[PDB]
Amino acid sequence: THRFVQKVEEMVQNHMTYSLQDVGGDANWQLVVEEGEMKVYRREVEENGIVLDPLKATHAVKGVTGHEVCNYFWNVDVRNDWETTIENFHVVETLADNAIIIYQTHKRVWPASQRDVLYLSVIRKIPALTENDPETWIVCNFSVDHDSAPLNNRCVRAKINVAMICQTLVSPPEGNQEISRDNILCKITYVANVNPGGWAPASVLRAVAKREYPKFLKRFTSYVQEKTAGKPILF
Ligand SMILES: CCCCCCCCCCCCC/C=C/[C@@H](O)[C@H](CO)NC(=O)CCCCCCCCCCCCCCCCC
Secondary structure (H helix, E strand, C coil), X not given: CCCCHHHHHHHHHHHHHHHCCCCCCCCXXXXXXXXXXXXXXXXXXXXXXXXXXXXXXXXXXXXXXXXXXXXXXXXXXXXXXXXXXXXXXXXEEEEECCEEEEEEEECCCCCCCCEEEEEEEEEEEECCCCECECCEEEEEEEECCCCCCCCCCCCEECEEEEEEEEEEEECCCCCCCCCCHHHXXXXXXXXXXXXXXXXXXXXXXXXXXXXXXXXXXXXXHHHHHHHHCCCCCCC
């Protein structure tokens, strides 16, 4: 129990309600990148030079579970093993054993000023209510205010709302035998809503995002495969 419990609930529920809705039929969402089971879509949104482009990606990763995926996405001790867009980060506050507040600076992209971000990062399990309701593991990373990290004059403060949402499919093997990682697949939906917090050139933001989101999703998912391949399956 902590002062951000209701905000956590709010963000989790929003993501379970809206982030899992199909965008495939919406004229405003475009398939920007596809590779293997990975599809990255974007809706181009610019409001008075504030480029908000909502981003949504789906992926299907063999040999890993949603619990595993969300653990490696959330766990700060393995962050630098896969993250490539950050200059530095540190934990500002531990709120609960599944919830922390992180301050991070991003690598500068010319010609825009450097961005920093201040966000609550929470990992949650959403129980299946019925058999056939998928169990869902989710990590929500969303900007919050914290007195220890006011606006500074060195960076533009971005605001983020990101979720990594995972459901795991197990194909029953032949009879009474072990479920191997060949029999498991993690369905991922990744969404990112980023307000750069200030003016940025749209064409540059868009080129970066189109390169960087796909790069992250391949690298991060391959990483989870690599770290887990030897291990017993954590469902
Ligand atoms: C050299 C390239 C540097 C690009 C950095 C641009 C600055 C972006 C500012 C906010 C980004 C927020 C992304 C979310 C981070 C955390 O939830 C999480 C844990 O670290 N990681 C990811 O979701 C992993 C996401 C990895 C992919 C992120 C790239 C995003 C590129 C487009 C965003 C640009 C918006 C801000 C304006 C930057 C000025 C050009």
